[PDB]
Short mmCIF file of C-alpha atoms in Angstrom, two decimals:
data_model
loop_
_atom_site.label_atom_id
_atom_site.label_comp_id
_atom_site.label_asym_id
_atom_site.label_seq_id
_atom_site.Cartn_x
_atom_site.Cartn_y
_atom_site.Cartn_z
CA UNK A 1 10.91 -5.80 29.14
CA UNK A 2 8.08 -7.28 27.27
CA UNK A 3 4.73 -6.15 29.09
CA UNK A 4 1.95 -7.30 26.88
CA UNK A 5 3.33 -10.45 24.96
CA UNK A 6 1.62 -12.97 22.74
CA UNK A 7 2.89 -17.32 22.43
CA UNK A 8 3.85 -19.62 19.57
CA UNK A 9 3.14 -19.18 15.78
CA UNK A 10 3.71 -22.46 14.13
CA UNK A 11 4.07 -23.03 10.37
CA UNK A 12 3.56 -25.40 7.99
CA UNK A 13 4.29 -25.41 4.12
CA UNK A 14 1.61 -27.41 2.66
CA UNK A 15 0.28 -28.51 -1.09
CA UNK A 16 -0.70 -25.83 -3.16
CA UNK A 17 0.13 -23.10 -0.49
CA UNK A 18 0.95 -22.17 3.03
CA UNK A 19 -0.49 -22.33 6.47
CA UNK A 20 0.24 -20.73 9.34
CA UNK A 21 -1.78 -21.05 12.92
CA UNK A 22 -1.56 -18.69 16.22
CA UNK A 23 -3.68 -17.91 18.66
CA UNK A 24 -5.70 -15.02 19.52
CA UNK A 25 -3.99 -14.52 22.90
CA UNK A 26 -2.01 -11.35 24.61
CA UNK A 27 -0.94 -12.17 27.92
CA UNK A 28 0.25 -9.67 30.22
CA UNK A 29 2.59 -11.28 32.95
CA UNK A 30 0.41 -14.16 33.86
CA UNK A 31 -3.11 -12.89 33.75
CA UNK A 32 -4.77 -13.00 29.93
CA UNK A 33 -5.43 -9.22 29.55
CA UNK A 34 -6.63 -9.69 25.74
CA UNK A 35 -8.10 -12.71 23.90
CA UNK A 36 -9.32 -11.21 20.82
CA UNK A 37 -5.95 -9.90 19.06
CA UNK A 38 -5.61 -10.93 15.80
CA UNK A 39 -1.97 -11.79 15.73
CA UNK A 40 -1.99 -12.97 11.95
CA UNK A 41 -1.60 -10.42 9.15
CA UNK A 42 -1.60 -10.39 5.49
CA UNK A 43 1.23 -8.82 3.43
CA UNK A 44 0.89 -7.69 0.01
CA UNK A 45 0.12 -9.56 -2.68
CA UNK A 46 2.16 -13.05 -2.08
CA UNK A 47 2.84 -12.60 1.65
CA UNK A 48 1.38 -13.75 5.42
CA UNK A 49 3.26 -13.59 8.65
CA UNK A 50 2.30 -14.04 12.46
CA UNK A 51 4.23 -12.54 15.39
CA UNK A 52 5.01 -13.45 18.86
CA UNK A 53 6.26 -11.49 21.68
CA UNK A 54 5.60 -8.19 22.28
CA UNK A 55 2.27 -7.06 20.58
CA UNK A 56 3.38 -3.15 20.63
CA UNK A 57 6.21 -4.09 18.86
CA UNK A 58 4.41 -6.39 16.08
CA UNK A 59 1.96 -3.63 15.88
CA UNK A 60 4.74 -1.43 14.92
CA UNK A 61 6.37 -3.98 12.34
CA UNK A 62 3.36 -4.00 10.50
CA UNK A 63 3.41 -0.23 9.80
CA UNK A 64 6.80 -0.83 8.54
CA UNK A 65 5.47 -3.30 6.22
CA UNK A 66 2.64 -1.47 5.01
CA UNK A 67 4.77 1.68 4.21
CA UNK A 68 7.18 -0.98 2.39
CA UNK A 69 4.24 -2.61 0.66
CA UNK A 70 2.44 0.70 -0.53
CA UNK A 71 5.46 2.26 -1.81
CA UNK A 72 6.18 -0.91 -3.66
CA UNK A 73 2.76 -1.26 -5.08
CA UNK A 74 2.68 2.30 -6.15
CA UNK A 75 5.22 1.73 -8.90
CA UNK A 76 3.25 -0.23 -11.10
CA UNK A 77 6.23 -1.38 -12.98
CA UNK A 78 5.03 -5.12 -12.72
CA UNK A 79 7.40 -6.74 -10.03
CA UNK A 80 6.72 -6.71 -6.46
CA UNK A 81 8.24 -8.38 -3.31
CA UNK A 82 7.20 -12.13 -2.77
CA UNK A 83 7.83 -13.88 0.75
CA UNK A 84 11.86 -13.91 0.08
CA UNK A 85 12.26 -9.99 -0.21
CA UNK A 86 10.09 -9.41 2.56
CA UNK A 87 11.40 -11.91 5.10
CA UNK A 88 14.72 -10.42 4.36
CA UNK A 89 13.89 -7.23 4.95
CA UNK A 90 12.30 -8.44 8.32
CA UNK A 91 15.40 -10.33 9.41
CA UNK A 92 17.51 -7.26 8.43
CA UNK A 93 15.36 -4.93 10.44
CA UNK A 94 15.23 -7.29 13.34
CA UNK A 95 19.19 -7.38 13.44
CA UNK A 96 19.67 -3.73 12.91
CA UNK A 97 17.45 -2.65 16.14
CA UNK A 98 19.17 -5.78 17.98
CA UNK A 99 22.40 -3.54 16.95
CA UNK A 100 21.35 -0.64 18.78
CA UNK A 101 20.24 -2.51 21.85
CA UNK A 102 16.62 -1.70 21.23
CA UNK A 103 15.59 -4.97 19.89
CA UNK A 104 11.79 -5.56 18.21
CA UNK A 105 10.69 -7.89 21.20
CA UNK A 106 9.15 -10.11 18.28
CA UNK A 107 9.77 -13.55 16.42
CA UNK A 108 8.06 -13.30 13.36
CA UNK A 109 7.05 -16.38 11.10
CA UNK A 110 6.36 -15.27 7.47
CA UNK A 111 5.57 -17.31 4.60
CA UNK A 112 4.02 -17.00 1.05
CA UNK A 113 3.96 -18.27 -2.48
CA UNK A 114 5.05 -16.48 -5.49
CA UNK A 115 4.99 -17.76 -8.99
CA UNK A 116 4.76 -21.35 -7.90
CA UNK A 117 7.86 -21.09 -5.50
CA UNK A 118 6.62 -21.22 -1.88
CA UNK A 119 8.61 -19.86 0.90
CA UNK A 120 8.23 -20.01 4.41
CA UNK A 121 11.03 -18.77 7.32
CA UNK A 122 11.26 -17.12 10.68
CA UNK A 123 12.95 -14.42 12.36
CA UNK A 124 14.39 -14.20 16.13
CA UNK A 125 14.27 -11.23 18.04
CA UNK A 126 17.66 -10.79 17.64
CA UNK A 127 18.16 -11.34 13.82
CA UNK A 128 18.29 -15.35 13.46
CA UNK A 129 16.64 -16.62 10.92
CA UNK A 130 16.20 -19.68 8.26
CA UNK A 131 13.94 -20.98 5.92
CA UNK A 132 12.21 -24.18 6.33
CA UNK A 133 9.19 -26.41 5.50
CA UNK A 134 7.49 -26.02 8.79
CA UNK A 135 8.27 -23.45 11.54
CA UNK A 136 7.55 -22.27 14.77
CA UNK A 137 8.04 -19.56 17.81
CA UNK A 138 8.20 -20.00 21.43
CA UNK A 139 6.98 -23.04 22.83
CA UNK A 140 5.87 -24.03 19.15
CA UNK A 141 9.73 -24.67 19.03
CA UNK A 142 9.37 -27.26 21.51
CA UNK A 143 6.37 -28.73 21.53
CA UNK A 144 5.37 -28.33 17.87
CA UNK A 145 8.03 -29.05 15.79
CA UNK A 146 8.50 -32.50 17.62
CA UNK A 147 5.25 -33.56 15.84
CA UNK A 148 5.59 -31.45 12.98
CA UNK A 149 8.73 -33.48 11.72
CA UNK A 150 7.37 -36.91 12.83
CA UNK A 151 4.25 -36.26 10.51
CA UNK A 152 5.03 -33.29 7.90
CA UNK A 153 4.85 -34.57 4.40
CA UNK A 154 5.81 -33.69 0.96
CA UNK A 155 2.26 -33.03 -0.40
CA UNK A 156 0.43 -32.67 2.55
CA UNK A 157 -3.54 -31.95 1.82
CA UNK A 158 -5.03 -29.11 2.94
CA UNK A 159 -7.15 -30.83 5.29
CA UNK A 160 -4.06 -33.56 6.57
CA UNK A 161 -2.49 -29.67 6.82
CA UNK A 162 -5.38 -28.42 9.14
CA UNK A 163 -5.59 -31.34 10.96
CA UNK A 164 -1.54 -31.38 11.63
CA UNK A 165 -1.79 -27.66 12.49
CA UNK A 166 -4.52 -28.03 15.12
CA UNK A 167 -2.75 -31.12 16.45
CA UNK A 168 0.44 -29.38 17.05
CA UNK A 169 -1.89 -26.48 18.61
CA UNK A 170 -3.99 -28.30 20.79
CA UNK A 171 -0.83 -30.14 22.01
CA UNK A 172 0.07 -26.31 23.06
CA UNK A 173 -3.02 -25.60 24.51
CA UNK A 174 -2.53 -28.73 26.88
CA UNK A 175 0.61 -27.37 28.05
CA UNK A 176 1.39 -23.96 27.52
CA UNK A 177 -0.63 -21.65 29.98
CA UNK A 178 0.00 -18.71 28.47
CA UNK A 179 -2.39 -19.93 25.61
CA UNK A 180 -5.74 -19.20 25.07
CA UNK A 181 -8.59 -21.26 22.96
CA UNK A 182 -9.28 -19.10 20.75
CA UNK A 183 -7.21 -19.61 17.34
CA UNK A 184 -6.66 -18.62 13.81
CA UNK A 185 -5.50 -20.51 10.54
CA UNK A 186 -4.17 -18.76 7.79
CA UNK A 187 -4.45 -20.05 4.50
CA UNK A 188 -2.31 -18.72 1.61
CA UNK A 189 -1.97 -19.92 -1.67
CA UNK A 190 -1.36 -18.64 -5.59
CA UNK A 191 -4.03 -17.15 -7.49
CA UNK A 192 -6.38 -17.46 -4.23
CA UNK A 193 -4.31 -14.97 -1.86
CA UNK A 194 -4.09 -14.94 1.71
CA UNK A 195 -7.79 -16.03 3.99
CA UNK A 196 -7.91 -15.93 7.54
CA UNK A 197 -9.73 -17.99 9.28
CA UNK A 198 -12.40 -17.18 11.50
CA UNK A 199 -11.72 -17.47 15.66
CA UNK A 200 -12.59 -20.46 16.71
CA UNK A 201 -11.88 -22.79 20.15
CA UNK A 202 -10.71 -26.87 20.04
CA UNK A 203 -12.56 -29.22 21.98
CA UNK A 204 -10.55 -30.91 24.30
CA UNK A 205 -10.42 -33.95 26.45
CA UNK A 206 -9.81 -34.64 30.45
CA UNK A 207 -12.12 -37.30 31.52
CA UNK A 208 -9.38 -40.00 31.65
CA UNK A 209 -9.70 -42.16 34.62
CA UNK A 210 -6.24 -41.46 36.37
CA UNK A 211 -7.00 -37.82 36.04
CA UNK A 212 -10.98 -38.03 38.03
CA UNK A 213 -8.98 -40.32 40.62
CA UNK A 214 -5.15 -39.49 41.11
CA UNK A 215 -4.10 -42.90 42.93
CA UNK A 216 -7.42 -44.52 43.56
CA UNK A 217 -9.63 -45.24 46.45
CA UNK A 218 -13.20 -45.00 48.18
CA UNK A 219 -12.19 -41.92 50.07
CA UNK A 220 -8.96 -40.67 49.23
CA UNK A 221 -9.16 -38.77 45.81
CA UNK B 1 15.62 44.75 -15.98
CA UNK B 2 17.19 43.60 -12.67
CA UNK B 3 13.56 42.47 -10.97
CA UNK B 4 13.36 39.32 -13.14
CA UNK B 5 16.73 37.58 -11.96
CA UNK B 6 15.56 35.82 -8.49
CA UNK B 7 12.17 34.49 -6.98
CA UNK B 8 12.37 36.75 -3.88
CA UNK B 9 12.63 40.05 -5.92
CA UNK B 10 8.98 41.68 -6.24
CA UNK B 11 8.22 43.64 -9.45
CA UNK B 12 7.51 47.42 -9.29
CA UNK B 13 3.98 46.28 -11.04
CA UNK B 14 3.77 44.06 -7.97
CA UNK B 15 4.44 40.75 -9.12
CA UNK B 16 6.83 37.88 -8.66
CA UNK B 17 8.11 37.43 -12.34
CA UNK B 18 9.94 34.07 -11.42
CA UNK B 19 6.30 32.16 -10.86
CA UNK B 20 5.15 33.57 -13.89
CA UNK B 21 8.09 32.29 -15.75
CA UNK B 22 7.58 28.87 -14.18
CA UNK B 23 4.11 28.98 -15.34
CA UNK B 24 5.29 29.86 -18.90
CA UNK B 25 7.17 26.66 -18.67
CA UNK B 26 3.92 24.50 -17.75
CA UNK B 27 1.87 26.39 -20.18
CA UNK B 28 4.12 24.93 -23.30
CA UNK B 29 4.02 21.34 -22.15
CA UNK B 30 1.56 18.33 -22.76
CA UNK B 31 -2.48 18.66 -21.63
CA UNK B 32 -3.57 17.40 -18.48
CA UNK B 33 -7.25 16.74 -17.81
CA UNK B 34 -8.99 15.93 -15.14
CA UNK B 35 -12.68 15.27 -14.67
CA UNK B 36 -15.11 14.80 -11.03
CA UNK B 37 -17.75 12.32 -12.73
CA UNK B 38 -20.68 11.36 -10.87
CA UNK B 39 -19.55 8.41 -9.24
CA UNK B 40 -15.40 8.83 -9.69
CA UNK B 41 -12.58 10.51 -11.18
CA UNK B 42 -10.98 10.23 -14.38
CA UNK B 43 -7.58 11.59 -15.20
CA UNK B 44 -5.86 11.64 -18.65
CA UNK B 45 -2.81 13.37 -19.95
CA UNK B 46 -1.58 13.84 -23.46
CA UNK B 47 2.09 12.50 -23.35
CA UNK B 48 3.60 13.81 -26.68
CA UNK B 49 6.28 11.75 -28.05
CA UNK B 50 9.34 13.23 -29.97
CA UNK B 51 10.92 9.63 -31.15
CA UNK B 52 9.87 6.49 -33.18
CA UNK B 53 11.42 4.52 -30.10
CA UNK B 54 10.38 5.65 -26.87
CA UNK B 55 8.63 2.14 -25.68
CA UNK B 56 4.87 2.62 -25.18
CA UNK B 57 4.86 3.06 -21.80
CA UNK B 58 7.93 5.23 -20.38
CA UNK B 59 8.13 8.38 -18.77
CA UNK B 60 4.55 8.27 -16.86
CA UNK B 61 2.84 11.29 -16.26
CA UNK B 62 -0.15 9.99 -13.85
CA UNK B 63 1.56 8.69 -10.62
CA UNK B 64 -0.31 6.86 -7.57
CA UNK B 65 0.42 9.19 -4.38
CA UNK B 66 -1.52 6.80 -2.00
CA UNK B 67 -3.60 3.72 -2.48
CA UNK B 68 -6.71 5.89 -2.42
CA UNK B 69 -5.56 8.84 -4.73
CA UNK B 70 -3.49 9.44 -7.69
CA UNK B 71 -1.60 12.53 -9.49
CA UNK B 72 -1.10 13.93 -12.96
CA UNK B 73 2.01 16.35 -13.59
CA UNK B 74 2.46 18.80 -16.72
CA UNK B 75 5.68 20.46 -17.49
CA UNK B 76 8.63 19.67 -16.30
CA UNK B 77 8.20 16.03 -15.23
CA UNK B 78 11.27 15.92 -13.43
CA UNK B 79 9.61 18.14 -10.86
CA UNK B 80 6.38 16.75 -11.04
CA UNK B 81 8.14 13.34 -9.47
CA UNK B 82 9.41 15.38 -6.77
CA UNK B 83 5.78 16.83 -6.01
CA UNK B 84 4.78 13.17 -5.89
CA UNK B 85 7.27 11.82 -3.93
CA UNK B 86 6.53 14.65 -1.46
CA UNK B 87 2.85 13.81 -1.94
CA UNK B 88 3.66 10.08 -1.56
CA UNK B 89 5.66 11.25 1.84
CA UNK B 90 3.05 13.45 3.53
CA UNK B 91 0.20 10.86 3.09
CA UNK B 92 2.86 8.44 4.66
CA UNK B 93 3.26 10.70 7.43
CA UNK B 94 -0.45 11.56 8.16
CA UNK B 95 -1.19 7.58 8.53
CA UNK B 96 1.79 6.70 10.76
CA UNK B 97 1.04 9.40 13.13
CA UNK B 98 -2.65 9.79 13.24
CA UNK B 99 -3.29 6.58 11.54
CA UNK B 100 -6.25 7.02 9.18
CA UNK B 101 -6.10 7.88 5.61
CA UNK B 102 -4.94 11.36 4.58
CA UNK B 103 -8.30 12.81 3.69
CA UNK B 104 -7.83 14.07 -0.08
CA UNK B 105 -8.50 17.64 1.06
CA UNK B 106 -6.04 17.56 3.70
CA UNK B 107 -3.06 16.04 1.05
CA UNK B 108 -3.79 18.70 -1.65
CA UNK B 109 -3.25 21.60 0.56
CA UNK B 110 0.08 20.06 1.70
CA UNK B 111 1.20 19.57 -1.40
CA UNK B 112 0.15 22.93 -2.51
CA UNK B 113 1.88 23.81 0.84
CA UNK B 114 5.43 22.71 -0.41
CA UNK B 115 5.20 23.86 -3.85
CA UNK B 116 4.53 27.16 -2.43
CA UNK B 117 7.39 26.54 0.53
CA UNK B 118 9.81 26.03 -2.64
CA UNK B 119 8.63 29.53 -3.53
CA UNK B 120 10.03 31.48 -0.74
CA UNK B 121 13.76 30.53 -0.61
CA UNK B 122 16.36 32.27 -2.55
CA UNK B 123 18.46 29.42 -3.34
CA UNK B 124 16.00 27.19 -4.74
CA UNK B 125 14.50 27.19 -8.48
CA UNK B 126 10.59 27.22 -8.50
CA UNK B 127 8.81 23.97 -9.37
CA UNK B 128 7.91 24.13 -12.81
CA UNK B 129 5.26 21.78 -12.74
CA UNK B 130 1.79 21.87 -12.01
CA UNK B 131 -0.48 18.75 -10.81
CA UNK B 132 -3.71 17.51 -11.03
CA UNK B 133 -4.83 15.59 -7.63
CA UNK B 134 -7.75 13.12 -8.09
CA UNK B 135 -8.22 11.40 -4.88
CA UNK B 136 -11.30 9.93 -3.48
CA UNK B 137 -12.19 9.03 0.33
CA UNK B 138 -15.46 9.22 2.79
CA UNK B 139 -15.83 12.48 1.04
CA UNK B 140 -16.38 11.05 -2.51
CA UNK B 141 -14.35 12.33 -5.38
CA UNK B 142 -12.48 15.40 -5.00
CA UNK B 143 -10.32 16.80 -8.10
CA UNK B 144 -7.91 19.21 -6.97
CA UNK B 145 -5.11 21.15 -9.37
CA UNK B 146 -2.25 22.73 -7.82
CA UNK B 147 -0.56 25.92 -9.67
CA UNK B 148 3.42 26.29 -9.70
CA UNK B 149 2.59 29.48 -7.61
CA UNK B 150 1.16 27.38 -4.80
CA UNK B 151 -2.54 28.12 -5.50
CA UNK B 152 -4.84 24.92 -5.09
CA UNK B 153 -8.58 24.78 -5.49
CA UNK B 154 -10.96 22.05 -5.62
CA UNK B 155 -12.44 22.03 -9.08
CA UNK B 156 -15.22 19.90 -11.10
CA UNK B 157 -12.57 20.04 -14.22
CA UNK B 158 -9.11 20.93 -14.40
CA UNK B 159 -6.98 21.35 -17.90
CA UNK B 160 -3.67 22.39 -17.88
CA UNK B 161 -0.66 22.64 -20.23
CA UNK B 162 -0.82 24.01 -23.86
CA UNK B 163 -4.42 22.63 -24.08
CA UNK B 164 -5.65 25.30 -21.35
CA UNK B 165 -8.27 27.43 -23.06
CA UNK B 166 -9.54 24.27 -25.71
CA UNK B 167 -9.98 21.77 -22.91
CA UNK B 168 -11.65 24.34 -20.30
CA UNK B 169 -13.92 25.10 -23.15
CA UNK B 170 -15.00 21.59 -23.75
CA UNK B 171 -15.49 20.90 -20.58
CA UNK B 172 -17.96 23.37 -19.67
CA UNK B 173 -20.26 22.05 -22.38
CA UNK B 174 -20.15 18.46 -20.37
CA UNK B 175 -22.73 17.33 -17.91
CA UNK B 176 -20.17 16.13 -14.97
CA UNK B 177 -22.40 15.47 -12.46
CA UNK B 178 -25.01 13.35 -14.26
CA UNK B 179 -22.24 11.15 -16.52
CA UNK B 180 -19.99 8.07 -14.86
CA UNK B 181 -17.35 6.45 -14.69
CA UNK B 182 -17.11 4.73 -18.17
CA UNK B 183 -18.45 8.08 -19.57
CA UNK B 184 -15.54 10.42 -18.77
CA UNK B 185 -13.35 7.86 -20.48
CA UNK B 186 -14.95 8.76 -23.55
CA UNK B 187 -15.14 12.53 -23.15
CA UNK B 188 -11.61 12.92 -21.63
CA UNK B 189 -10.00 10.78 -25.04
CA UNK B 190 -12.47 12.77 -27.34
CA UNK B 191 -11.14 16.41 -25.75
CA UNK B 192 -7.92 15.38 -25.25
CA UNK B 193 -7.78 14.14 -29.14
CA UNK B 194 -9.34 17.36 -30.15
CA UNK B 195 -6.93 19.84 -28.36
CA UNK B 196 -3.90 17.90 -29.89
CA UNK B 197 -2.01 20.22 -32.13
CA UNK B 198 -0.80 17.96 -34.87
CA UNK B 199 0.36 20.79 -36.90
CA UNK B 200 2.31 21.10 -33.41
CA UNK B 201 3.05 18.07 -32.41
CA UNK B 202 3.51 14.19 -33.60
CA UNK B 203 2.22 10.76 -32.52
CA UNK B 204 1.05 11.59 -29.43
CA UNK B 205 0.48 9.02 -26.42
CA UNK B 206 -2.94 9.04 -24.21
CA UNK B 207 -3.01 8.05 -20.82
CA UNK B 208 -5.64 7.66 -18.33
CA UNK B 209 -6.27 6.64 -14.73
CA UNK B 210 -9.40 6.98 -12.79
CA UNK B 211 -10.81 6.26 -8.84
CA UNK B 212 -14.12 5.03 -8.48
CA UNK B 213 -16.53 2.40 -6.90
CA UNK B 214 -15.42 0.28 -9.69
CA UNK B 215 -11.70 0.26 -8.86
CA UNK B 216 -13.05 -0.28 -4.83
CA UNK B 217 -11.90 3.45 -4.60
CA UNK B 218 -8.51 3.07 -5.39
CA UNK B 219 -6.23 4.64 -8.10
CA UNK B 220 -5.20 2.48 -11.10
CA UNK B 221 -4.70 2.93 -14.80
CA UNK B 222 -7.86 2.27 -16.92
CA UNK B 223 -8.75 -1.12 -18.38
CA UNK B 224 -7.15 -1.01 -21.68
CA UNK B 225 -9.88 -2.40 -23.31
CA UNK B 226 -11.95 0.79 -22.38
CA UNK B 227 -8.94 3.04 -23.26
CA UNK B 228 -9.01 1.57 -27.10
CA UNK B 229 -12.89 1.95 -27.31
CA UNK B 230 -12.41 5.64 -26.03
CA UNK B 231 -9.59 6.09 -28.35
CA UNK B 232 -11.83 4.86 -31.37
CA UNK B 233 -14.56 6.62 -30.32
CA UNK B 234 -12.25 9.77 -30.25
CA UNK B 235 -11.24 9.38 -33.63
CA UNK B 236 -14.20 8.45 -34.96
CA UNK B 237 -15.77 12.01 -33.59
CA UNK B 238 -12.85 13.66 -34.66
CA UNK B 239 -13.49 12.80 -38.16
#
């Protein structure tokens, strides 16, 4: 069963690089046990992934990928895994562990840029995978892919990318009940490398007259 | 004589002749050198060539073993590759179990343990390569050297292969603690070139590697410009 689980991890391929956002919450049933669980990591030189779902399993996937990437690096023969190979390895491991009826309970968003070809893709807890311009997991797949599809552009700027991604993440924060206001945006680019935003919280709006007074009256509401 | 045909026999002198025969295999290979400098470790091997073709940059003998540590093999490079593979696997295992970088000391003891362990089995050929290990961790530089027998010790400077005697004599002259990286490069290159017997071999290739604060405490080949400068200095000194 999933015990300590996280939530949506949206993804948006923008000009000159890739952006991924994910709140810092790990919930335990209904409680938010944890509110500072960095759920985005940088993998190798050319990659970056976030995970949703069980946080123990995600921490294990990090060990798998760290051994993979260290073994890859120690060769020093001048070729390394780009986003594509890393994502394919992730799909293979997730599917294999599904075949054992012992799944890794996570949903993985992995993306990155290598040789000027920027890749972004996803993997499910049962091996379902696809590579796209913008991906999401969990409720980010209901409440964020509509707005991502609606507003994504071929050459989205970095600031426009951040503002779109925050639009999505705020829309989730309004209506997910599993999401904490803390969150991180991760930037990966060619020749800059991965760069993870410091944690922060988004301003939210509640002062609508209909909210203040459901119905309307001097006494009732 | 009958007492020199397996590794588990044990000679009337008191000696295990097969390990000496592996040592004799190491002694007649290209020289390897490691120096513990003030702020880091520099390794340098004498990868001698046999053909004009071997593309410069071929059978590397200085292998990374973990992000924080590297290794250099002498003798049968084929066996050195398995020692290096086992060192890699053990560092990885330590990370996976305890969750922190395997200390260099522990890694050296484990590699030496494995090399010895392969000396106990009747159905295993003993390893024919002894390695220098030059990790770098919260304890600073730590240079270890592992013999085929299994004996490993922490050194300030090591030297195996044909160049044993000359290399050790040249290193003894050297003020190891005062000299820093980018200075170990020149000293290693100079002594390697001095050791090289043109009357015995031809057109060798020089490798080097080092772990220090400059490399942010990781193992990585020398920036080739530094190697070129050091090789020039070594040639000038040899003149």
